Amino acid sequence: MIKQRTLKRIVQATGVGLHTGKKVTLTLRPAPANTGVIYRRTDLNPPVDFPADAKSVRDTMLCTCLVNEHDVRISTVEHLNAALAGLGIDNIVIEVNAPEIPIMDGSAAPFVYLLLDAGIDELNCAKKFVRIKETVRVEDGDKWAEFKPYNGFSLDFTIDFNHPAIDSSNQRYAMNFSADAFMRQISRARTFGFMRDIEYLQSRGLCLGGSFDCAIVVDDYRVLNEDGLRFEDEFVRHKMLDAIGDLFMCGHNIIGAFTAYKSGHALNNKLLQAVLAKQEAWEYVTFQDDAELPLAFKAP
Ligand SMILES: CCCc1cc(C2=N[C@@H](C(=O)NO)CO2)cc(OC)c1OC
Numbered sequence: 274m275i276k277q278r279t280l281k282r283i284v285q286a287t288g289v290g291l292h293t294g295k296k297v298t299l300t301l302r303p304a305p306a307n308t309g310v311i312y313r314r315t316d317l318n319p320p321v322d323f324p325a326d327a328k329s330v331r332d333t334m335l336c337t338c339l340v341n342e343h344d345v346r347i348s349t350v351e352h353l354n355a356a357l358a359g360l361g362i363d364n365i366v367i368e369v370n371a372p373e374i375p376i377m378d379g380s381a382a383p384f385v386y387l388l389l390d391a392g393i394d395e396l397n398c399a400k401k402f403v404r405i406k407e408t409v410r411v412e413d414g415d416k417w418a419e420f421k422p423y424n425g426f427s428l429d430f431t432i433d434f435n436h437p438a439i440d441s442s443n444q445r446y447a448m449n450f451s452a453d454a455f456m457r458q459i460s461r462a463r464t465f466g467f468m469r470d471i472e473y474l475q476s477r478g479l480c481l482g483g484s485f486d487c488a489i490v491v492d493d494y495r496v497l498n499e500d501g502l503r504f505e506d507e508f509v510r511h512k513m514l515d516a517i518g519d520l521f522m523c524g525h526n527i528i529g530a531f532t533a534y535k536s537g538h539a540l541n542n543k544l545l546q547a548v549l550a551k552q553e554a555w556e557y558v559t560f561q562d563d564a565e566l567p568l569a570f571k572a573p
C-alpha cells in the first residue's frame with residue numbers, strides 16, 4: 274500500500290516574517306490519517322485554522338495567503354506547502370505564533386530539513402492521488418499553464434524575465450517529480466526581488482523581513498548576492514518550486530504532466546480550480562498490493 278504520511282514528532286523552528294520582519298515561531302504537529310494539511314495561527318484567541326484548499330487561496334505581491342470565512346489570513350504558505358508536497362505529507366498541523374510563516378532562506382530546503390528532523394510516519398491508510406484524465410488548459414494573455422494525462426509526475430516550466438541576468442539557456446526546466454528530485458533539484462531554489470522594489474516597500478514600512486539572507490536580490494543589471502546563484506537556472510527552478518506548492522492546495526499529490534509558460538501563483542491556482550471544477554477531468558486513485566485484495570475478489 275502507498276500510505277498517507279505525517280510526522281513522527283512535533284518540531285519547532287524560528288525565523289523572520291517577510292512582511293513584519295519580526296521573529297516568528299513555527300511548530301509542526303503529527304496528525305491522524307484523512308485530516309489533511311491544516312495551517313493554524315496561535316497568536317489569535319481562539320486560534321484560527323486554515324485548511325489547505327484551492328478555493329481558500331489569496332495571492333498578493335509578496336506572498337500567497339489562506340483566508341478564512343471572515344477575511345482573516347495566514348501568509349507566506351507557498352514554500353512550506355511545496356516542501357509538504359515534495360515529501361508527500363498528507364496530514365499535518367502547521368502552527369505559527371504570528372500572521373505569517375517565516376521566510377527562512379527564501380527556498381523550501383530549510384522546511385525539508387525541518388520535516389526530516391521531525392521524521393516521516395506512514396499511516397495505515399491508502400494515500401489518495403488526483404489523477405489527470407483530460408487535458409486542461411488556462412491562459413492569461415501570452416501566459417498559460419496546462420495539465421495533461423501522464424502515468425507519473427512531471428513538471429515543465431518556462432519563464433521570460435528578459436532580465437540581463439537570465440540567459441535564454443536558463444529560461445526552461447523540465448523534470449520528473451519525486452521526493453528525491455524535489456530535494457536535490459528544486460528545494461534549495463530561492464525566491465527573488467529587485468533591490469528597488471525592496472527598498473521602496475521598506476520605505477513604506479513593508480516587506481521589512483526582506484534581506485540578502487532570504488532571497489536572490491538583483492538590480493537592473495546583475496545578481497547582487499555575494500555567492501551568486503545556487504543554480505545557473507535558479508530562477509526557473511524556483512517558479513517550479515512555487516507551482517508544486519500551488520498544486521498541493523488540493524491536499525493530494527497529482528498524477529499527470531504539468532506544463533507552464535510564464536505562469537505564476539494566480540495562474541497556477543486558476544489551473545488547479547479549473548481541473549477540480551471539471552469532474553470528468555480527474556479522479557481519485559489508490560495503490561495496494563495483490564495480497565491486500567479482498568479474499569473474496571480473488572474470484573475467477
Ligand atoms: C528580499 C526579497 C523580497 C521579495 C520577496 C518576494 C517573495 N515572494 C514570495 C515567493 O517566492 N512566492 O512564491 C516570497 O517572497 C517577492 C518580492 O518581489 C516580487 C520581493 O521583493 C520585494
Ligand SMILES: [Zn+2]
Pocket residue numbers: 351352464511515
Ligand atoms: Zn516562491
